[PDB]
Design a protein around this nucleic acid. Structure first.
Ligand SMILES: [K+]
Ligand SMILES: [K+]
Lengths: 120, 157, 31, 100, 238, 246, 49
RNA sequence: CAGAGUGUAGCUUAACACAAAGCACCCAACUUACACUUAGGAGAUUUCAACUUAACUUGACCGCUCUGACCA
């Protein structure tokens, strides 16, 4: 029943969500964030963390992105986050890295769509 | 709004090049060369394209503007050979000549020596390098010959 | 170096097989 | 023909080595240009101090530099006393004409 | 005038005559590129011809229905035999020459795949020093002109050189020993100019042991430590 | 009529004389990255953050927790770089990564996460849930002692308590099993409070459990200052927050 | 055309905030945009630019 | 050979620790090429000792950059 931030129809990305999965890919690392629309980070998984880095041959490949998805999905369930929106660019959505990360999240239990607000 | 201090915060068209609808060749100053054509001719098409690609990427690394990269028309030559104990020339081989041009501009006078030293040092075997100054004739030579215009022009002569 | 950009293959989708050959020039040099 | 697992493995590992070998070729070229540029600019600075009249001439462009033609290296050098076969060269390039 | 004696030095270079040999890794990559090129290519005319003739032999052996007697006199594999025979008869020019075997460092026919630099020996205060040819600057002349003049004052040559640009590519300033060091003659200021040796060579008269053509690696044997450090900056070995 | 800007205007540092020679973005991703950075900076004009951003206090949040642990970075970095080289030296690891068949052991990741970044992720998550706001009036602490709480459901199953996962009042009908790492001679106090359950006062809480003077991690030997009461979230009142504080 | 609800004005849901031929003002938080580029309030509250 | 300054891979006033980061860079595929995008690749604290802390502070030790000596 909470308001979502509707509007912003002429810019990208949308604000009409409560939580969103945001994936940051750098030259050396892969980080995935779950953040509230107000901008507060809720949970996070990064290959910069030693807990994840120690088990990865590379922190910049498809395997690294899939591993981040699996780790983040577990942390989401422990925090109570079962729903979020994912707002990729066209090239990001088509990439195998993001497709493997998304499958990891859904296999991990998280649903990457949010239920509609109830207005009445 | 005009009166407010934030007036013009949304201005953007001054940050983009003026694109308001062949090309005039710019003669260089006394410290820069004009448009330069870098011709790369080889009997092998892959070598000419691989070096033309190398020169293009090298220019980008050195912040030398690449006006255009294009291929010149291929030239086919039949190679006949006089047969043993005979006066008849027989076709031996057909050799094709492939040319690629990387057109650059703004090359500094002092830096040309270094740039030329680098691109000549990396020239593959069988590839000829020819760096010329761009002229209208070079651009016009890329276009089909017009026979009808020649006949009408001949009448005026 | 002459080998800086000499290791190549035909970058075409459809092309017939090509064979490496030595082209002997008129002075005796080869390429 | 499908490649064997070992062949595809050998081809992938060779390409990984090719990335690092070409990275070090580029480094040598990038540091050769830098050395030449520093040497030239440091020589021009010293020239300006010694005689500003010669420095002005030095930084000017050369009218005779272009056209600059250089053929690439051969595989084997010219043979001192090699007689090529007799023959003819017949250009058979198609001429394209625009009508209309 | 000024205390320093202006000098113009010439860095005359013979570019490689032949291509550099492939390194071990380049050989493997060259093999893979050729392998890939064949795999992704269409059948060539010489391949299709060799295929049909194989099938024709089967059709002239199994079916026994062939209606053409002449066909082709020569086959595809037979034609390849003639080609391979001609190739073996031809002898290529030596990439490693006699001057390489004899280490004749005065000839231009050594180290065909390397880049050579011209060094001359001059006597300075009854001392033999190896330097890149140089000449003293004269009024009414550019510093490049001095370098081009240096070329014309060598010992009996017909060398044609192409100068690259008007700016110097390096410099070296030294001071004379205090014995002869004077307020009016403090030292000298050399300025090197690179050039490419198009064609020509010292004549047999001019080959009399007062110059060498040396690669950048073997360049220190002749030059002095400080003079070497300044020449190894604009002399590339790519 | 015009008014001078109250500060530096956007895009002023761009030199417009050398526009052709200036590097362009060339990619949507590079512009967006710069755009997101500019949006986060403070500005002298009216912004969305000014009207919609939560009004945090300027003074920093007082830390009331245990001191950070002391670490030798030099020794830590040496051991970490050595472990990575050993992992990368293995040829099967390279092939599993290249063929995209490798995976991480999630259980081992969590164990190391509990000992490294875990405490700071819990603090960040507790701040998001408003626990520091409601329990300590904005004062924060890093939970440096991992606290493991699990409700026994049936006889073979446990329902763990993490940091916001949903547990039903039926599952929490009896006191949970609590374990932590404690040295001998240490004393501890555990309490359970309902932040949102109070039926009368909006700013008050219900104390559901209070164990005091616990010797080490032997929770069953602590004094029962307040006996365990199961959660009773009222029907139609939404989702309540129950927090265990050690 | 132009602004119908200036800075600080109270709007009910559905109220048109501005009409325009081209995008002079863009829709922000809780502001819808019509097919004709019309800006309208999606929530009851105070208009801010 | 001496005297000063100087110190993370190419850049950075990246590095609180939870961690050696971000960018630049190299190969392949796409592209005439470039560019973009995808999928891969390589990396650093000069070295030891001092609340063991310290990439950071003080010392030496190395590399670097200048100023003189030396220099044809
Ligand atoms: K309540
Ligand atoms: K409208």
């Amino acid at each position: 029943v909470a308001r979502k931030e509707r509007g912003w129809r002429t810019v990208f990305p949308s604000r009409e969500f409560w939580h969103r999965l945001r994936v940051i890919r750098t030259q050396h690392h892969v980080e995935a964030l779950v953040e509230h629309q107000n901008g507060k980070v809720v949970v996070s998984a990064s290959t910069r963390e030693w807990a994840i880095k120690k088990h990865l041959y590379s922190t910049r490949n498809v395997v690294a992105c899939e591993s981040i998805g699996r780790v983040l999905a577990q942390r989401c369930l422990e925090a109570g986050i079962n729903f979020m929106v994912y707002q990729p660019t066209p090239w990001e959505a088509a990439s195998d890295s993001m497709k493997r990360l998304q499958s990891a999240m859904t296999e991990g239990g998280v649903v990457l769509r949010e239920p509609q607000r109830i207005y009445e | 709004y005009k009166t407010k201090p934030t007036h013009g915060i949304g201005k953007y068209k001054h940050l983009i090049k003026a694109e308001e609808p062949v090309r005039a060749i710019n003669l260089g100053t006394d410290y820069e060369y004009g448009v330069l054509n870098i011709h790369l001719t080889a009997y092998d098409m892959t070598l000419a394209e691989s070096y033309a690609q190398y020169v293009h990427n090298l220019c980008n690394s050195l912040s030398i503007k690449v006006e255009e990269s294009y291929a010149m028309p291929t030239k086919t030559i039949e190679v006949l050979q006089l047969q043993d104990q005979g006066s008849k020339m027989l076709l031996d081989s057909v050799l094709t000549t492939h040319e690629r041009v990387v057109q650059i501009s703004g090359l500094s006078a002092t830096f040309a020596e270094i740039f030329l030293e680098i691109i000549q040092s990396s020239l593959p075997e069988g590839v000829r390098l020819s760096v010329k100054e761009h002229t209208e004739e070079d651009f016009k030579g890329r276009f089909k010959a017009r026979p009808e215009l020649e006949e009408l022009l001949a009448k005026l002569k | 170096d002459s080998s800086r950009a000499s290791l190549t293959r035909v970058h075409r989708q459809a092309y017939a097989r090509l064979y490496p050959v030595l082209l002997v020039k008129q002075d005796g040099s080869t390429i | 023909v499908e490649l064997t697992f070992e062949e595809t493995e050998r081809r992938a590992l060779l390409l990984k080595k090719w990335s690092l070998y070409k990275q070090q070729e580029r480094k040598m070229e990038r540091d050769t240009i830098r050395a030449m540029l520093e040497a030239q600019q440091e020589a021009l600075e010293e020239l300006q101090l010694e005689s500003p009249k010669l420095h002005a001439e030095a930084i000017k462009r050369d009218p005779n530099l272009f056209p600059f033609e250089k053929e690439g290296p051969h595989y084997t050098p010219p043979i001192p006393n090699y007689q090529p076969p007799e023959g003819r060269y017949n250009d058979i390039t198609k001429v394209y004409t625009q009508v209309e | 005038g000024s205390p320093w004696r202006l000098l113009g030095a010439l860095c005359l270079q013979r570019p490689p005559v032949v291509s550099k040999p492939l390194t071990p890794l380049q050989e493997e990559m060259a093999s893979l590129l050729q392998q890939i090129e064949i795999e992704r290519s269409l059948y060539s005319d010489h391949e299709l011809r060799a295929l049909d003739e194989n099938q024709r032999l089967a059709k002239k052996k199994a079916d026994l229905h062939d209606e053409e007697d002449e066909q082709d006199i020569l086959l595809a594999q037979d034609l390849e035999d003639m080609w391979e025979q001609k190739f073996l008869q031809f002898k290529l020019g030596a990439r490693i020459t006699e001057a390489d075997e004899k280490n004749d460092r005065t000839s231009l026919n050594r180290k065909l795949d390397r880049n050579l630099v011209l060094l001359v020996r001059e006597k300075f205060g009854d001392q033999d020093v190896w330097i890149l040819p140089q000449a003293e600057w004269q009024p009414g002349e550019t510093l490049r002109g001095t370098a081009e003049r240096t070329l014309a004052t060598l010992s009996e040559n017909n060398m044609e050189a192409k100068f690259l640009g008007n700016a110097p590519c390096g410099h070296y300033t030294f001071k004379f020993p205090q014995a002869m060091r004077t307020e009016s003659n403090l030292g000298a200021k050399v300025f090197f100019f690179k050039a490419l040796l198009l064609t020509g060579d010292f004549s047999q008269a001019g080959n009399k042991g007062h110059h060498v053509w040396v690669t950048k690696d073997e360049l220190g044997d002749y030059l002095k430590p400080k003079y070497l450090a300044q020449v190894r900056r604009f002399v590339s070995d790519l | 009529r015009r008014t001078p800007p109250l500060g530096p205007m956007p895009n002023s540092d761009i030199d417009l004389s050398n526009l052709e020679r200036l590097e362009k973005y060339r990619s949507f991703d590079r512009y967006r990255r710069r755009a997101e950075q500019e949006a986060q900076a403070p500005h002298w004009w009216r912004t969305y953050r000014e009207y919609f951003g939560e009004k945090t206090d300027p003074k920093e949040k007082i830390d009331i927790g245990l001191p950070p642990p002391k670490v030798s970075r030099t020794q830590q970095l040496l051991e970490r770089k050595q472990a990575i080289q050993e992992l990368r030296a293995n040829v099967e690891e390279e092939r599993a990564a290249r063929l995209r068949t490798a995976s991480v052991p999630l259980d081992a990741v969590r164990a190391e996460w509990e000992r490294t970044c875990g405490p700071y992720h819990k603090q960040r998550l507790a701040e998001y849930y408003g626990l520091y706001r409601d329990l300590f009036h904005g004062a924060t602490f890093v939970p440096r002692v991992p606290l493991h709480v699990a409700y026994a459901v049936g006889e073979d199953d446990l329902m763990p308590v993490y940091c916001g996962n949903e547990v039903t009042p039926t599952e929490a009908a009896q006191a949970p099993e609590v374990t932590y790492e404690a040295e001998e001679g240490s004393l501890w106090t555990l309490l359970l409070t309902s932040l949102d359950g109070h039926l009368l006062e909006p700013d008050a809480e219900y104390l559901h459990w209070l164990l005091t003077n616990i010797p080490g991690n032997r929770v069953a030997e602590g004094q029962v200052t307040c006996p365990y009461l199961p959660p009773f979230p009222a029907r139609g009142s939404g989702i309540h927050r129950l927090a265990f504080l050690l | 055309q132009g602004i119908k609800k200036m800075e600080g004005h109270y709007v009910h849901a559905g109220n048109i905030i501005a009409t325009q031929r081209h995008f002079r003002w863009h829709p922000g938080a809780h502001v819808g945009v019509g097919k004709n580029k019309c800006l309208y309030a999606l929530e009851e509250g105070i208009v801010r630019y």
